[PDB]
Design a protein around this ligand. Structure first.
Ligand code: DYM
Length: 351
């Protein structure tokens, strides 16, 4: 497999089990925040990591529970972090469900002004963000994984998500991805329009001039579903299967996507299991002509063996001068969450 700068297990089964990773890079801090669900999802835990380039290593600090990220009598899950470059405020969106076909799922948000050391009490955004549609869903979720902040005038916040809709009384709820939008730095929220039928966990990234929001979602088909928004996430008109991006047997697996400075304005990177018959062999895919579906490359092998959920983060310029990437993924039959750090040069030397 591909040689990288670092490969370290940052979460592993012990008194508890860990799943559903989310990674967040803090530019001016040369630091990363690794989030995960702590299952008996009971709570959300976090680990802070400081990146030292000279040693090509991130040093991770002790694991700590995000105390405020919970609603009394509910389980917290799907950590979705975001760093506001405008205010220097950290956001952590998550889902809260009763300790135990009516919708009882809640959308929550906690914030930190000291880079994740301490958090505010949670804000239940459910009613104001979803409105009437709430009763038309069996449940919903955000992410999991890092969110997006657009470089539009308002520096809008974009939270990838999906909802199980009760479209027909005799049919089971059908999932459709969409984005929650805020144009006032998280004070108020709006529900964006749904992308095609049968789309689940997704992530968004912004490319390029025309501003385009690309959405990459998990589907129940043999390939990923990709959608494009030309109006900052409100509408995802274009939508199609991406045959080159395979989805494993059961009902696919969650994957991650980010944008990053092109060596030549931006390219896309995507990670997801590459075996067509199982969740194994984490692969990295490059799209040098985003968001063109046929431009997705062949996958490069990042990790052999059992691999599931993942999350990416652009970490700036790497030691070899090329784009540096951080990746957090579930491995070994969910026995752990591994942190992988590598550059574009290491993974796609021909590009
Ligand atoms: C909120 C929640 O339970 N998330 C689940 C997610 O659910 C997908 C879909 O909703 C199923 O119908 O899938 C998986 C999974 O390993 O496949 C792990 C997450 O923890």
């Amino acid at each position: 497999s591909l040689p990288v700068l670092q490969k370290e297990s940052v979460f592993q089964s012990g008194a508890h089990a860990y799943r559903i990773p989310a990674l967040l890079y803090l530019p001016g801090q040369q630091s990363l925040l690794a989030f995960a669900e702590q299952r008996a999802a009971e709570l959300i835990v976090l680990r802070r990591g400081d990146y030292d380039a000279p040693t090509h290593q991130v040093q991770w600090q002790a694991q700590e529970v995000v105390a405020q990220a919970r609603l009394d009598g509910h389980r917290s899950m799907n950590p979705c972090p975001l760093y506001d470059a405008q205010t220097g405020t950290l956001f952590l969106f998550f889902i809260a469900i009763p300790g135990q076909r009516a919708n009882v799922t809640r959308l929550c948000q906690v914030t930190s002004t000291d880079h994740g050391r301490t958090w505010s009490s949670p804000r239940d955004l459910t009613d104001a963000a979803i409105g009437p549609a709430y009763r038309e869903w069996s449940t919903f979720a955000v992410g999991p994984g890092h969110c997006l902040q657009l470089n539009d005038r308002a520096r809008s916040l974009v939270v990838p998500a999906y909802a199980y809709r009760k479209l027909h009384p005799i049919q089971r709820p059908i999932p459709s991805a969409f984005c929650f939008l805020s144009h006032d730095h998280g004070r108020t929220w709006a529900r964006g329009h749904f992308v095609a039928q049968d789309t689940l966990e997704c992530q968004v990234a912004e490319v390029e001039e025309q501003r385009v929001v690309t959405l990459n979602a998990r589907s129940h088909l043999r390939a990923r579903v990709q959608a494009q928004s030309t109006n900052d996430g409100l509408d995802f008109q274009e939508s199609q299967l991406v045959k080159k991006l395979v989805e494993p047997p059961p009902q696919g697996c969650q994957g991650s996507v980010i944008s990053f400075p092109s060596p030549r304005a931006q390219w896309l990177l995507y990670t997801h299991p590459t075996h067509s018959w199982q969740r194994a062999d984490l692969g990295a895919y490059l799209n040098p002509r985003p968001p063109a579906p046929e431009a997705w490359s062949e996958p490069v092998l990042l990790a052999k063996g059992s691999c599931a959920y993942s999350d990416l983060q652009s970490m700036g310029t790497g030691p070899d001068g090329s784009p540096l990437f951080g990746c957090l993924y579930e491995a070994n039959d969910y026995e752990e969450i591994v942190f992988l750090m590598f550059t574009l040069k290491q993974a796609f030397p021909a590009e």
